[PDB]
Amino acid sequence: MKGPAFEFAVAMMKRNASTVKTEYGEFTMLGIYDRWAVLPRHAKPGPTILMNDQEVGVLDAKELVDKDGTNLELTLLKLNRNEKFRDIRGFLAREEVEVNEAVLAINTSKFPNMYIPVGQVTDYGFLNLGGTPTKRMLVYNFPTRAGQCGGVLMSTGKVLGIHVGGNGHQGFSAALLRHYFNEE
Amino acid sequence: KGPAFEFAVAMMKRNASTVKTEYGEFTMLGIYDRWAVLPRHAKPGPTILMNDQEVGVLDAKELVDKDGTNLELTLLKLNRNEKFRDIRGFLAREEVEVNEAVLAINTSKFPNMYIPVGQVTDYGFLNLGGTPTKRMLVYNFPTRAGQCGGVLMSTGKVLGIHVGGNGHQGFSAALLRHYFN
Numbered sequence: 001m002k003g004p005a006f007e008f009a010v011a012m013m014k015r016n017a018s019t020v021k022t023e024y025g026e027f028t029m030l031g032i033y034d035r036w037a038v039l040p041r042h043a044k045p046g047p048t049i050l051m052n053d054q055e056v057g058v059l060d061a062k063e064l065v066d067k068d069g070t071n072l073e074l075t076l077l078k079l080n081r082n083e084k085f086r087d088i089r090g091f092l093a094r095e096e097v098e099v100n101e102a103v104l105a106i107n108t109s110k111f112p113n114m115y116i117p118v119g120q121v122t123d124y125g126f127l128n129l130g131g132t133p134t135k136r137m138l139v140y141n142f143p144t145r146a147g148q149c150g151g152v153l154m155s156t157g158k159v160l161g162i163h164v165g166g167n168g169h170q171g172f173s174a175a176l177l178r179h180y181f182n183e184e
Numbered sequence: 185k186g187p188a189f190e191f192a193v194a195m196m197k198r199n200a201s202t203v204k205t206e207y208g209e210f211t212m213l214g215i216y217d218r219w220a221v222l223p224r225h226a227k228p229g230p231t232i233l234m235n236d237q238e239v240g241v242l243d244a245k246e247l248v249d250k251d252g253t254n255l256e257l258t259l260l261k262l263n264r265n266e267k268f269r270d271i272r273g274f275l276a277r278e279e280v281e282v283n284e285a286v287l288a289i290n291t292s293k294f295p296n297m298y299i300p301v302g303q304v305t306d307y308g309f310l311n312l313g314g315t316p317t318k319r320m321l322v323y324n325f326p327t328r329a330g331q332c333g334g335v336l337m338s339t340g341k342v343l344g345i346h347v348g349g350n351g352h353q354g355f356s357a358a359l360l361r362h363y364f365n
């Protein structure tokens with residue numbers, strides 16, 4: 001609900017977010033640093049994506065799992081483009097973030113530049129999501145809709161995670177942690 | 185953009201509802217007492233569905249200027265016991281222009297969504313949906329069906345109500361203080 005959180009969110013989406021289509025559907029994508037970006041794992045990007053209606057090559061993809069192989073529901077993508085993202089790694093936490101007030105930001109054809117005050121975010125942990133055991137889920141209560149996956153969950157100076165699932169009035173993000181961007 | 189969003193979220197929580205008529209689903213802003221506003225195109229009947237509940241309409245006034253020109257707003261007096269928080273002090277005497285506005289929507293398609301639409305210009309006259317219409321405010325963003333009744337706001341100001349557009353251009357009817365007496 002906070003002004004500064006929305007101010008932060010809008011600036012973040014303007015600088016680093018895009019609309020991406022894969023063979024599996026349309027998503028919000030967040031650039032992280034250099035040419036590295038993130039999508040929900042179920043976006044299932046191939047060797048070419050559509051980024052703001054433009055064909056972009058994918059040079060590497062990394063589907064994130066924990067040390068025991070459990071799904072984290074995020075895929076990191078290295079893009080064949082010459083433009084670089086603003087390095088936003090400093091806005092990513094070392095561990096799953098909780099906040100009193102978060103904003104979920106969506107950038108797709110269905111929801112072009114929409115911001116939703118989702119209220120409190122709780123570190124929920126384990127969830128069987130779409131039939132897949134998944135960890136490091138953040139939960140929040142708002143009226144969820146199809147097409148919001150990839151939405152960026154934020155608060156002032158904080159990128160918490162990426163929207164990946166939900167049902168009815170409950171939404172879940174995969175926590176977006178800083179160490180995910182280290183080879184190890 | 186921050187202060188505009190903060191003002192907008194509080195306004196919607198307190199004064200906005202979702203309304204269904206034969207002509208679709210709308211965001212509806214309550215103004216004071218039992219008086220609310222809808223786009224004229226909503227064409228409310230003697231009853232409306234407000235947050236999924238049947239609510240009687242006691243009076244409906246389709247606003248026109250002194251020469252009968254469409255303003256694209258209908259004021260409705262609702263048969264409800266609850267009074268709206270009085271927000272008339274946030275309404276200007278004339279059409280407002282700002283560098284940064286937020287458009288706020290609350291429907292089943294767009295439940296509690298806020299859009300940074302940037303600059304708002306007093307465009308004036310427009311032939312909208314075939315009807316000559318005045319006091320149009322214009323802003324540039326990717327417009328969508330189901331956003332009518334959306335509340336256009338800036339820091340400490342309610343500017344207008346979304347009534348139309350096409351492609352990447354949206355229009356609000358200016359919400360002027362004198363409309364409410």
Ligand SMILES: *[C@@H](CC(=O)OCC)[C@H](C[C@@H]1CCNC1=O)NC(=O)[C@@H](CC(=O)[C@@H](NC(=O)c1cc(C)on1)C(C)C)Cc1ccc(F)cc1
Binds near residue numbers: 027042129132165168
């Ligand atoms: C986003 C995907 C999308 O629409 O992109 C365009 C192709 C979508 C968002 C949810 C739909 C309804 N509300 C949402 O927030 N995500 C999905 O559809 C994932 C699957 C789910 O969310 C399931 N939900 C649950 O399992 C669930 C469990 C609980 C307690 O709450 N929800 C569906 C039954 C809706 C996609 C997905 C994610 C991860 C996977 F391993 C497989 C599939």
Ligand SMILES: *[C@@H](CC(=O)OCC)[C@H](C[C@@H]1CCNC1=O)NC(=O)[C@@H](CC(=O)[C@@H](NC(=O)c1cc(C)on1)C(C)C)Cc1ccc(F)cc1
Binds near residue numbers: 315328330350351355
């Ligand atoms: C909201 C009402 C609704 O029922 O949802 C759509 C079915 C809707 C919003 C616009 C739809 C697309 N973009 C929008 O912002 N409003 C309308 O559909 C009105 C009609 C229009 O907006 C027309 N647009 C124009 O005439 C126009 C002209 C210019 C320069 O830019 N746009 C349509 C061609 C989209 C409803 C309306 C208003 C007044 C009337 F007299 C009749 C109908």
Ligand SMILES: [Cl-]
Binds near residue numbers: 241
């Ligand atoms: Cl009545």
Ligand SMILES: [Mg+2]
């Ligand atoms: Mg193909």
Ligand SMILES: [Mg+2]
Binds near residue numbers: 283303
């Ligand atoms: Mg400007």
